[PDB]
Specification:
1 chains, mainly alpha, toxin
C-alpha cells in the first residue's frame, strides 16, 4: 500500500480469520518484510493475535521455517513474552521453537528475567523443556 504500511498488519490487528486465510491462500510473500523489517508472522505475533498466529503456524509449517528471522534476528518467543501472554507461548513452545540461532542486539532471557518481573513463563521454560 505504500511506505511499508501493508493493510495485513491492521487486518491482523482487527483479529479476523477469514481475510487472513484468504490472503494466505492467495500466496502472500512471507519472506517480504515491511518498513520495520519484520516478517508478517512476526507482525501478527506483535499484534497479539492468538488465532491468526495459530493458523499461520499450523497450516504453514513448510512455508515458513522455524529458524526464519527478521532483520534484527529475533524469534517470536521474546515478542510474545513482551505482552505477557501464556497460552500462545505454551503453544509456541510445544512446536519446537529454535533457540540455537544467532541474534543481533545480544540480550539474554535469564538476566532480564531476574530483574524484569515475569515468573510464570520462565518457570514453564525451566520446568519441562530441559
Amino acid at each position: 500500500c505504500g511506505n511499508g504500511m501493508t493493510a495485513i498488519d491492521k487486518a491482523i490487528t482487527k483479529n479476523h480469520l477469514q481475510v487472513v486465510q484468504f490472503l494466505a491462500a492467495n500466496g502472500v510473500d512471507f519472506r517480504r518484510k515491511n518498513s520495520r523489517g519484520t516478517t508478517p508472522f512476526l507482525t501478527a505475533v506483535a499484534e497479539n493475535a492468538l488465532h491468526i498466529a495459530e493458523y499461520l503456524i499450523r497450516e504453514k509449517r513448510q512455508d515458513i521455517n522455524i529458524n526464519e528471522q527478521n532483520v534484527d534476528k529475533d524469534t517470536a518467543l521474546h515478542l510474545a513474552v513482551y505482552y505477557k501472554n501464556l497460552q500462545m507461548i505454551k503453544l509456541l513452545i510445544k512446536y519446537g521453537i529454535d533457540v540455537t540461532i544467532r541474534n543481533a542486539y545480544d540480550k539474554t532471557a535469564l538476566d532480564i528475567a531476574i530483574d524484569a518481573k515475569f515468573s510464570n513463563i520462565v518457570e514453564y521454560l525451566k520446568t519441562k523443556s530441559g
